[PDB]
Amino acid sequence: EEERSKVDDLRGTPMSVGTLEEIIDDNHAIVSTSVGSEHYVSILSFVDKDLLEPGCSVLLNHKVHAVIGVLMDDTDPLVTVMKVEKAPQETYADIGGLDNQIQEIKESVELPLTHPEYYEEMGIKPPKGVILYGPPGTGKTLLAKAVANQTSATFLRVVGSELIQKYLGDGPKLVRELFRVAEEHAPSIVFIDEIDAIGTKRYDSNSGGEREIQRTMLELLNQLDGFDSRGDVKVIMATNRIETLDPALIRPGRIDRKIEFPLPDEKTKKRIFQIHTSRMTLADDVTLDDLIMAKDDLSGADIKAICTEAGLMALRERRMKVTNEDFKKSKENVLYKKQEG
Amino acid sequence: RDKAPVQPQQSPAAAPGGTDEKPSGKERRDAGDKDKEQELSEEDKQLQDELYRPALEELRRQIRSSTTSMTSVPKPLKFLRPHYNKRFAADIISVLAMTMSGERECLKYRLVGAGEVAKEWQELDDAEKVQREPLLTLVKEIVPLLMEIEQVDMLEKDIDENAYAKVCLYLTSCVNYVPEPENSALLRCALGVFRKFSRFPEALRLALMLNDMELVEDIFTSCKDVVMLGRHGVFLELSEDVEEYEDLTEIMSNVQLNSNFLALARELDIMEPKVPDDIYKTHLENNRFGGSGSQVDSARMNLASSFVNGFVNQDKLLTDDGNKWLYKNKDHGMLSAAASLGMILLWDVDGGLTQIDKYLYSSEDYIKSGALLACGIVNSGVRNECDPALALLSDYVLHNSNTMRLGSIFGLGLAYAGSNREDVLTLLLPVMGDSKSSMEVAGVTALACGMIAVGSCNGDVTSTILQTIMEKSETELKDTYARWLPLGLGLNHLGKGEAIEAILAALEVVSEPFRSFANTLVDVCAYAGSGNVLKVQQLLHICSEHFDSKEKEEDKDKKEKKDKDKKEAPADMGAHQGVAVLGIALIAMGEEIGAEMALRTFGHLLRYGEPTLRRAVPLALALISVSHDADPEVSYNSIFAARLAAMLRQLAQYHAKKGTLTLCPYHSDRQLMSQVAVAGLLTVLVSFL
Secondary structure, three states, X not given: OHHHHHHHHHHOOOOOOEOOOEEEOOOEEEOOEXXXXXXXXXXXXXXXXXXXXXXXXXXXXXXXXOEEEOOOOOOHHHXXXXXXXXXXXXXXXXXXXXXXXXXXXXXXXXXXXXXXXXXXXXXXXXXXXXXXXXXXXXXXXXXXXXHHHOOOOXXXXXXXXXXXXXXXXXXXXXXXXXXXXXXHOOOOEEEEEOOOOOOOOOOOOOOOOHHHHHHHHHHHHXXXXXXXXXXXXXXXXXXOOOOOOOHHHOOOOOOOOEEOOOOOOHHHHHHHHHHHHOOOXXXXXXXXXXXHHHOOOOOHHHHHHHHHHHHHHHHHOOOOEEOHHHHHHHHHHHHXXXXXX | OOOOOOHHHHOOOOHHHHHHHHHHHHHHHHOOOOOOOOOHHHHHXXXXXXXXXXHHHHHHHHHHHHHOOOOOXXXXXXXXXXXXXXXXXXXXXXXXXXXXXXXXHHHHHHHOOOOHHHHHHHHHHHHHHHXXXXXXXXXXXXXXXXXXXXXXHHXXXXXHHHHHHHHHHHHHHHHHOOOHHHHHHHHHHHHHHHHHOOOXXXXXXXXXXXXXXXXXXXXXHHHHHOXXXXXHHHHHHHHOOOOHHHHHHHHHHHOOOOOHHHHHEOXXXXXXXXXXXXXXXXXXXXXXXXXXXXXXXXXXXXXXXXXXXXXXXXXXXXXXXXXXXXXXXXXXHHHHHHOHHHHOOOOOHHHHHHHHOOOOOOOOHHHHHHHHHHHHHHOOOOOOOHHHHHOOOOOOOOOHHHHHHHHHHHHHHHXXXXXXXXXXXXXXXXXXXXXXXXXXXXXXXXXXXXHHHOOOOOOOOOHHHHHHHHHHHHOOOOOOHHHHHHHHHHHHHOOOOOOOHHHHHHHHHOOOHHHHHHHHHHHHHOOOOOOOOHHHHHHHHHOOOOOOOHHHHHHHOHHHHOOOOOOOOOOOOOOOOOOHHHHHHHHHHOOOOOOHHHHHHHHHHHOOOOHHHHOOHHHHHHHOOOOOOOHHHHHHHHHHOOHHHHHHHHHHHHHHOOOHHHOHHHHHHHHOOOOHHHHOOHHHOOOOO
């Protein structure tokens, strides 16, 4: 009450922005802030003198430069790249016939957070995460698994080690914060899509050599190893080429799981196809079976995107209805897309 | 084509050019015209012109319906009397007749109060029976009983779309947004079409919202016609209130047709399959008896532990665990432990007498009175435990049998729910006329006669609770009386659909804020919950009242009111400062399955310093979850390590391990900041199987 109208004069009139640096163990905090100006603050209010911690920012008086208050300021590229939020509307009921694959990871997506008891009733402690892979280009069908995992906890998806390869290290460090800001958001989940590290070779901008890119992946696991980190952030990882990864990534984690993605079979293509054309009204002669029955070795993306070609001409005529006379004939274009392209 | 040949046709006024141009415009009316109908500014002059002038009404409603109007648009259709599966039929019928007839039904539904809109409404009903996509046509045709003949007119073939889709969205949205009186039309015409249909728990949830006595006779001749069976006896007895199993056992005491509905649908057969199968498929170990039953000693925590051990139910082992544990125990905890053998065994009718019989008529008043309390706990269909207690009850001021009156009036309140049992209430007239200084005499009087009286026929203002109003306002002493008598008052107010009893007790009762707190208790209990937000903004204003206990119960009504639309139930009560309000939200989470947002609110509510609120958190905290579960428990061990807090922790451990029967006893618990004599009745919130 009166304290608010008392210390406002000590605060007053303005107060600067400092950078919290180091402490005399007597709690006289030596700071380097522009330009390299120090101070000694043992002040009684608002602290929490400990946790403000080295390597932070402070707010200093003019006379004389005592930090009377502190903030946590981001923004920054740190928090921005993790979020927000999202939970897109797709579900794990979208992909059928592979339930054998997701019912495996079902307990892996379920047991952390939801339904935790029989983890600790067994007490065997399986919090080892997951690894993913499959042909040819997959992992958005695993995003169709990941879009379902958005029903629980919180999630971030990252792509590649690219943020390290943009320049000479720089270490892992942008991965480090992304790893330890998931501790700030713990419990959470983090996934890196299709690790290209040594799978792809050349770099954008400037990078080298192999070992610094080798070790930034080696440190990626060794930080996640870790010494000694309980933090989850249940780690989801995927690459569609099992070759290039260093095989030692499996044993520390995830040890138990790397999902095998089977290519779609005849009835799986039938199970998958109608989910798309459910919304797009087919004409009388349009049939799901015969087309995909004759066609072989398709992809869920194509069998989803084969409906888009009819979404051109029928929409060029501005028609709500698909026509198989086109959908047959237009399929040649997507057939030409796979054949010649 | 261009509008050059067809556009100056509106300029002549000769009849043949109109009577062939309008069929020519009918062929192009499949897309209306080439475009957005910019004939309007030239053909609106043609209004005053008068053979095929109803075709001119079709053109006029076509173009006015084509651009925009709210009342002049359906006027050519009500003047037209529509005459003379298609794309054009989807146009002039579906979007134009749906939106146009919708604004005519809204504008005349709010305006006048004809048969023309009834004929158009049945015609659009038939046309959307042709279109066969319900959901939107249904929710449009609610707001014009009309909906009755709509349902029996519509229901021939499709069962689960109308039933599941219509009755789901319109049951949920009808209790959610719609006021009460049309829900009766939902329930009665849904009784018609579900009376036509099978899968009878739709009609049993109609018995949940209706509370009708003809329905259970129809569903027992029909659910005996469909011979699982004891399982619908189980959720029959769970689903039913206090009235209709006694009306059911009297009219089925007359007829019964196999006597197996007298077996099932009164008592003892919801409970005969469970307890052996409870022993069979479950296998519960001993290290929580010993470990959770080891949590130290102090005749409180230890006393509570006896209760915790007692509510364990793998056999009635903690019942028969020796002696010297109840001899360490003291008076109201001796009530709790004498009733605890009731709590281990809410079955074993023959075993109940032969286990409690040692503690019956013993040397101690609390052993015998809590023993008859246990007899009231174990069952609800015996009624032969009444007379050994019933005979003794009279003491005329404050002798022994008034404590047997507390356990036996309360336990007999546990025992029966008749049409109106009157003999036990004629016993209750020398109880309130007795008026012992012990609170729970009038406490279990009001609460027990309320358990008899919950589900009354729109309540009653009868001389029972009228008598306890007048004999309540007789003595202004020990304000727990002024709190727990409006408990049973509002319990007799339960069963309402439309009761003016808040106005009646408002005229009789209101005064200085003891009886204005009675006013807010009747205001709570008379208003179970609907789309009735006017009392929620009344809640907003009188929530700011300076008397801070009508705040407690009046804001505490929220978990009764908005229990179904529970996404709005997160409120900023923690962001307020009237600490009992944080208690109110702390109640308002409660016991259901308890999502991560609720436990997230227990993140802050777990950490508080006042021992009644830190006491108040583990109770609903472990009710809402009936490591993970034990993680906040060991977190409470991190909180304290007072004695209250230890007791609260024990209660939380016990918790760890609109049916009115689960609605009463925690509002009975809402005065917890008190003596252990009050906590001698704390073990009478019997809301779990």
